[PDB]
UniProtKB/Swiss-Prot annotation, chain A:
Cell location: Nucleus, Nucleolus
UniProt superkingdom: Eukaryota
Gene label: UTP13
Name of the protein described by the UniProt record: U3 small nucleolar RNA-associated protein 13
Whole-protein residues included: 7 to 234 of 817
Naturally occurring in which organism (per UniProt): Saccharomyces cerevisiae (strain ATCC 204508 / S288c) (Baker's yeast)
Regions crossing the membrane: none
Subunit field text: Interacts with snoRNA U3. Interacts with MPP10. Component of the ribosomal small subunit (SSU) processome composed of at least 40 protein subunits and snoRNA U3.
Swiss-Prot record, chain D:
Functional description taken from the UniProt entry: Involved in nucleolar processing of pre-18S ribosomal RNA and ribosome assembly.
PTM-bearing positions, type Phosphoserine: S23
Comment block on domains: The WD repeats are grouped into two tandem seven-bladed beta-propeller regions.
Gene designation: UTP21
Shown residues in whole-protein numbering: 743 to 890 of 939
Additional remarks: Present with 2020 molecules/cell in log phase SD medium.
Annotated compartments: Nucleus, Nucleolus
Highest taxon in the source lineage: Eukaryota
Protein name (database record): U3 small nucleolar RNA-associated protein 21
Disulfide bridge partners, by residue number: none
Complex formation: Interacts with snoRNA U3. Interacts with MPP10. Interacts (via WD repeats) with UTP18. Component of the ribosomal small subunit (SSU) processome composed of at least 40 protein subunits and snoRNA U3.
UniProtKB/Swiss-Prot annotation, chain E:
Family: Belongs to the UTP14 family.
Organism, as annotated: Saccharomyces cerevisiae (strain ATCC 204508 / S288c)
Something else known: Present with 1470 molecules/cell in log phase SD medium.
Protein name according to UniProt: U3 small nucleolar RNA-associated protein 14
Source domain of life: Eukaryota
Record's subcellular location: Nucleus, Nucleolus
Region feature Disordered, mapped onto this chain: 5-29
Subunit structure, interactors included: Interacts with snoRNA U3. Interacts with MPP10. Component of the ribosomal small subunit (SSU) processome composed of at least 40 protein subunits and snoRNA U3.
Known function: Involved in nucleolar processing of pre-18S ribosomal RNA.
Full-protein positions shown: 772 to 835 of 899
Swiss-Prot record, chain G:
UniProt-recorded name of the protein: Small ribosomal subunit protein uS11A
Sections of the chain in a coiled coil: none
GO biological process, any: maturation of SSU-rRNA from tricistronic rRNA transcript (SSU-rRNA, 5.8S rRNA, LSU-rRNA)
Location of the protein in the cell: Cytoplasm; Nucleus, Nucleolus
Species of origin: Saccharomyces cerevisiae (strain ATCC 204508 / S288c) (Baker's yeast)
Function noted in UniProt: Component of the ribosome, a large ribonucleoprotein complex responsible for the synthesis of proteins in the cell. The small ribosomal subunit (SSU) binds messenger RNAs (mRNAs) and translates the encoded message by selecting cognate aminoacyl-transfer RNA (tRNA) molecules. The large subunit (LSU) contains the ribosomal catalytic site termed the peptidyl transferase center (PTC), which catalyzes the formation of peptide bonds, thereby polymerizing the amino acids delivered by tRNAs into a polypeptide chain.
Length: 221, 240, 177, 133, 57, 199, 127
């Protein structure tokens, strides 16, 4: 008898799915592979399985806002960055900590990755070399957020801890520009909006809005 | 087995979907020990949730942690003792704990018990001045003199009974004159057993004299003021 | 590069001159006996001339291939003597007074460095393998001692052990030994 | 037919060799010898280290060359016949095969000239067969 | 002669055990004498230019 | 690290690039004399091949193994070392315990005659006699047959070897404890030995 | 700087549990099991099984954010045997390898002062 098999798409692993700016592209981890599917009205189909190893499950995965690069960290403590055009794993590098938080810039250029140890590293996407590594606070990282215009000179990285702490760091200066201990629990979410204002969602119950400046002006709005 | 041939039992009829995310719904609390020990901050524990402060407070009023005095005090030579603390008053992520019991480690007990000597186990039930009914087990082993030639060092039943009586009266006098915080303060630097030795030094030369175990049995009416003093008030931040 | 902006900062002379050769090929020359060595230590005082007698070669230039040259006076090696190395690699030749040609600037080099650089280049047309063994690992791959030709003609150099391969009908060289 | 006739501290054993039938039931050096052969080759390669100064172009191939120049191979045939068998095989094997095929063409011409000469018939045929080999 | 002098001489061994004192490890960080057959100073071949006597035998 | 952002085409940014652990294991006295006796053959494998600082607190009769943050390489080296010393303490020969270091799949299993069947006094002595066999012939037969090492303590018996091997050795030993005479046991041993050799 | 759990390693005679909990043993974090990682039942108490079990639990513990563990190994105790087996040894080795910081090892095997009868019967249990 002829047979056709329907396979599940988002299964197993506890990592968030991701999409580009257009619904056309979706990434999703099954327990060991990473389905990519083209979402087109009516003609929703698949691009390609990737099957590095069936044993270690994908820990977290990000898809750059333009459907060009996919970056995924596995249980083995190493990141694989994968080109979508050529459909090929371009680079790989260990990260010395089981990471769980990925964030790609609006521009397709930078990707910050943060893991349980507390140190986070931000890497150039196109060229597999990290820019700089942040020792950071001591708790397990909870979220990351980038801020930078398409053509600007200011770039900010906000990192949220499992403790009620959020550190805003400069990228062109790499200083603990402001250390904000305000939540009592983990900072699940983060967001930067232009004038500056900062958003921090403390998992306990709270959503904090900080009026903020490149200079020491940083108060609870 | 998760094998294909492991045939299905009544068993796997209706499962439940893993959607709860338990260690996202849960929460972290840190505990603190009384002021007798030196390192008071030890470890963290988990509470199911906080939606019921009923649940939070009740779980942490039932909790009982169990640490080793080496970890607690910094000196690695208390490796074999191991105390039990129970937390009963909680405030602001931070748990206040007091003494709840003692024991050795099974390795140390097997290590002390050797073959050519007598073991003596004394067992006294008492109550402190704090109204904490308590039970203390002590042990000792009949060592041998510096010019022994006899292979063994056995004591007679008479010497055994005399030493048991002495140990019982020493333990009860000490822990009836004491209070429970004072009891732990005595029990830390091995002073009761120094007394036991120094008292039994004329009946029979002993060795490895230890206060093997302490057991709480009854507790008095609770006292949050006593706890806070034993550990040695706050405002908020104007959310609007 | 780390630390984005750019700042300027035994010294292994062998590699230094190997590098300089990689730059300055092909304008090479070899000193020739015997008017250059201490035979010409006679007889002036406080200023001695050691008559430079050096055939310049470059196969890309068969005309000035194998031509006698005299040193430039401005060089710090102006008619100096008792200097060890044999091949001198120069920047540019120029004709001046007494209808005499001289080299611009120099580097002192020897056999196996010239061999390395020209190998990476083009000029070393090797010989048949050479009593000394010549082991073949596979029909394509063999080791062999070869004397190369650095050359209307050019000289040769010392024999070198070489790990060369057959491909495309020639015994191209992989690495030296 | 005339070639003559002729540990680690941390062991790494397997699930059947030691008692790990579990890993067996869920069951999950030639390159080393190649590396060692490379190494031996290096060993003789740098053990023979004579730096005597030897001519670039061998006598045989040179003589062939001016034979081609003069379009007559008499001397080349003379020396080819005077060779020793091991030699003859060595050079014929170690000719060249580049694009222009000049060496092979010249050798073929030499053999044809010899067969015209009507001398050493057997050795000229056998040289031709060796070249074809 | 040097060989036999050192053979016949009184040995002195080092009986230290790395350990018992303190950490005798990769990172960082008890002597007795045994009488030989003859001490070097007593041998009846000293001040003999070309002689080698074996007190051992 | 000097530092400036460079703005590339499309204006996008570009930058440039930029635990000691301890364990303690005690030693009984009757196994404390031989530890001193063969100590000099013990620390070299610990320090040279495992890079593991050692010590012996003879004022607490323990051996302390601590691993350095930088010198050691293998994380599991510490645990293998602890196991090796532990086996030597339980009473195995030095070279046997070294084998326990060398490999990675050697285990030690212990149990007791009262764990198998409650025996009292003279019966228990006879049972240990039946395990040992005259001049240890029986125990040596089992060890050679199943490629393991057996040590009888007073009543505890310990078996070192690979997993299935110690299972087989335990099996035979338990039969001996219940009371099958050494003749029948030896017959069974030679049968399983032939089968294991063929496989 | 770190946080500590307590890894309770129950090495039964024909299975193995590796149960990680918080201090005070109340809030269980991860629990795996021999056969559960090995789909058979000869091998449900095998060193390989326990090795996989401990590897996975180390994964889950590193999830939750606990970096060190004290360990309480255990045998079935009671009237049965009383010493942890190869299963427990394998689990311990695998986990320490996996790189959680091991703090303090104990053997909390329940040893009856005065046991009741044991399952065997007068003739003896096994074989």
């Amino acid at each position: 008898y002829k047979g056709i098999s329907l396979n599940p798409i988002y299964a197993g692993s506890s990592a968030v799915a991701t999409v580009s700016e257009n619904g056309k592209i979706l990434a999703t981890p099954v327990l060991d592979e990473i389905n990519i599917i083209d979402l087109t009205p009516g003609s929703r189909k698949i691009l390609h399985k990737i099957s590095n190893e069936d044993e270690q499950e994908i820990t977290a995965l990000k898809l750059t806002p333009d459907g060009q690069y996919l970056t995924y960290v596995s249980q083995a403590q190493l990141l694989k960055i994968f080109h979508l055009k050529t459909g090929k794993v371009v680079r790989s590098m260990k990260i010395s900590s089981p990471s769980y938080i990925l964030d790609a810039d609006s521009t397709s250029t930078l990707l910050a990755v943060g893991g349980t140890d507390g140190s986070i590293i931000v890497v150039d996407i196109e060229n597999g070399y990290i820019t700089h590594s942040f020792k950071g606070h001591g708790g397990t990282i909870s979220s990351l957020k980038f801020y930078g215009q398409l053509n600007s000179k200011i770039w900010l990285l906000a990192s949220g801890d499992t403790n009620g702490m959020v550190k805003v760091w400069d990228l062109v200066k790499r200083k603990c520009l402001h250390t904000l201990q305000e939540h009592t629990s983990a900072v699940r979410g983060l967001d930067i909006i232009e004038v500056l204002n900062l958003l921090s969602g403390g998992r306990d119950d709270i959503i904090n809005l900080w009026d903020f400046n490149m200079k020491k002006k940083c108060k609870l709005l | 087995a998760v094998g294909k041939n492991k045939r299905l039992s009544k068993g796997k009829k209706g499962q439940k979907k893993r959607v709860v995310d338990p260690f996202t719904r849960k929460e972290w609390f840190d505990i603190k020990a009384p002021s007798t020990f030196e390192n008071r901050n030890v470890g963290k524990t988990l509470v199911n949730k906080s939606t019921g402060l009923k649940s939070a407070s009740d779980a942490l009023k039932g909790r009982v942690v169990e640490v080793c005095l080496a970890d607690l005090q910094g000196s690695e030579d208390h490796s074999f003792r191991k105390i039990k603390l129970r937390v009963d008053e909680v405030q602001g992520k931070n748990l206040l704990t007091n003494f709840h019991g003692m024991d050795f480690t099974t390795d140390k007990l097997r290590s002390m018990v050797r073959k050519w000597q007598t073991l003596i186990e004394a067992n006294v039930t008492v109550k402190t001045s704090d109204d904490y009914v308590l039970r203390i087990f002590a042990i000792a082993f009949t060592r041998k003199q510096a010019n022994q030639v006899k292979r063994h060092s056995y004591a007679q039943s008479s010497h055994i009974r005399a030493i048991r009586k002495v140990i019982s009266e020493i333990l009860t006098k000490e822990v009836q004159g004491s209070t429970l915080a004072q009891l732990t303060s005595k029990l830390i630097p091995e002073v009761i057993n120094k007394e036991i030795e120094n008292a039994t030094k004329d009946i029979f030369p002993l060795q490895n004299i230890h206060v093997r175990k302490v057991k709480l049995l009854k507790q008095p009416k609770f006292d949050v003021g006593a706890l806070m003093a034993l550990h040695g008030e706050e405002k908020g931040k104007k959310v609007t | 590069n780390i630390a984005v902006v750019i700042r300027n900062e035994v010294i292994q002379i062998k590699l230094l001159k190997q590098m300089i050769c990689a730059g300055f090929v092909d304008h090479v020359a070899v000193r020739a006996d015997v008017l250059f060595p201490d035979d010409a230590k006679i007889t002036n005082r406080t200023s001695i001339i050691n008559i430079p007698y050096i055939p310049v070669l470059a196969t890309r230039t068969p005309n000035i291939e194998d031509c006698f040259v005299y040193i430039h006076p401005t060089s710090i090696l102006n008619n100096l003597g008792e200097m060890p190395p044999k091949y001198m690699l120069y920047y540019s030749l120029h004709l001046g007074g007494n209808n005499k040609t001289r080299m611009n600037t120099l580097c002192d080099i020897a056999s196996t460095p010239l061999a390395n650089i020209a190998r990476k280049g083009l000029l070393l047309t090797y010989s048949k393998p050479l009593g000394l063994k010549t082991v073949n690992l596979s029909p394509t791959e063999r080791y062999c001692y070869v004397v190369p030709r650095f050359g209307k003609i050019g000289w040769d150099l010392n024999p070198i052990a070489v790990h060369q391969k057959k491909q495309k009908g020639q015994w191209t060289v992989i690495k030296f030994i | 037919r005339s070639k003559p006739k002729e540990l680690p501290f941390f062991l790494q054993l397997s699930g059947e060799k030691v008692g790990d039938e579990a890993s067996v039931r869920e069951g999950i050096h030639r390159r080393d010898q190649e590396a060692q052969k490379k190494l031996d080759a290096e060993e003789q390669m740098n053990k023979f280290k004579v730096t005597g100064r030897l001519g670039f172009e061998s006598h045989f191939t040179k003589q062939l060359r001016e034979g081609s120049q003069s379009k007559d191979y008499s001397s080349l045939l003379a020396t080819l016949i005077n060779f020793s068998p091991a030699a003859v095989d060595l050079e014929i094997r170690s000719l060249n095969s580049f694009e222009p095929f000049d060496e092979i063409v010249w050798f073929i011409d030499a053999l044809t000239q010899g067969l015209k000469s009507n001398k050493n018939f057997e050795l000229y045929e056998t040289f031709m067969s060796l070249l074809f080999k | 002669k040097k060989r036999v002098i050192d053979d016949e001489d009184d040995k002195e061994v080092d009986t230290t055990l790395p350990g018992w004192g303190e950490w005798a490890g990769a990172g960082s960080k008890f002597i007795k004498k045994v009488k030989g057959v003859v001490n070097k100073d007593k041998r009846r071949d000293k001040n003999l230019q070309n002689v080698i006597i074996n007190e051992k035998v | 690290e000097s530092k400036t952002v460079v703005v590339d085409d499309q204006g996008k940014p570009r930058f440039t690039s930029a635990k000691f652990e301890s364990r303690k294991i005690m030693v009984p006295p009757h196994r404390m004399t031989p530890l001193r006796n063969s100590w000099t053959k013990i620390y070299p494998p610990l320090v040279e091949h495992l890079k593991l600082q050692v010590r012996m607190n003879l004022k607490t009769k323990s051996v302390e193994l601590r691993t350095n943050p930088k010198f050691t390489t293998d994380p599991g080296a510490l645990q293998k070392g602890a196991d090796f010393i532990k086996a030597f303490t339980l009473g195995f020969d030095l070279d046997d315990s070294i084998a326990l270091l060398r490999l990675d799949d050697l285990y030690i299993e212990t149990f007791e005659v009262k764990d198998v069947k409650t025996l009292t006094g003279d019966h228990l002595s006879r049972a240990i006699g039946r395990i040992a066999g005259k001049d240890g012939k029986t125990k040596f037969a089992i060890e050679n047959a199943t490629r393991t090492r057996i040590v009888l303590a007073d009543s505890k018996i310990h078996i070192l070897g690979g997993f299935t091997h110690i299972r087989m050795a335990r099996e035979s030993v338990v039969s001996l404890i219940l009371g099958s005479p050494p003749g029948k046991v030896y017959g069974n041993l030679r049968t399983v030995a032939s089968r294991l050799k063929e496989r | 700087s770190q946080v500590f759990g307590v890894a309770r390693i129950y090495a039964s005679f024909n299975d193995t549990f590796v149960h990680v909990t918080d201090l005070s043993g109340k809030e269980t974090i991860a629990r795996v099991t021999g056969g559960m990682k090995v789909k058979a039942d000869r091998d449900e108490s095998s060193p390989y099984a326990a090795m996989l079990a401990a590897q996975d639990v180390a994964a889950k513990c590193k999830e939750v954010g606990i970096t060190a563990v004290h360990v309480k190994i255990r045998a079935t105790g009671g009237t049965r045997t009383k010493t942890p087996g190869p299963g427990g040894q394998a689990a311990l080795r695998a986990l320490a390898r996996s790189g959680l910081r091991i703090g303090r090892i104990e053997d909390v095997t329940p040893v009856p002062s005065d046991s009741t009868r044991k399952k065997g019967g007068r003739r003896g249990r096994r074989l």
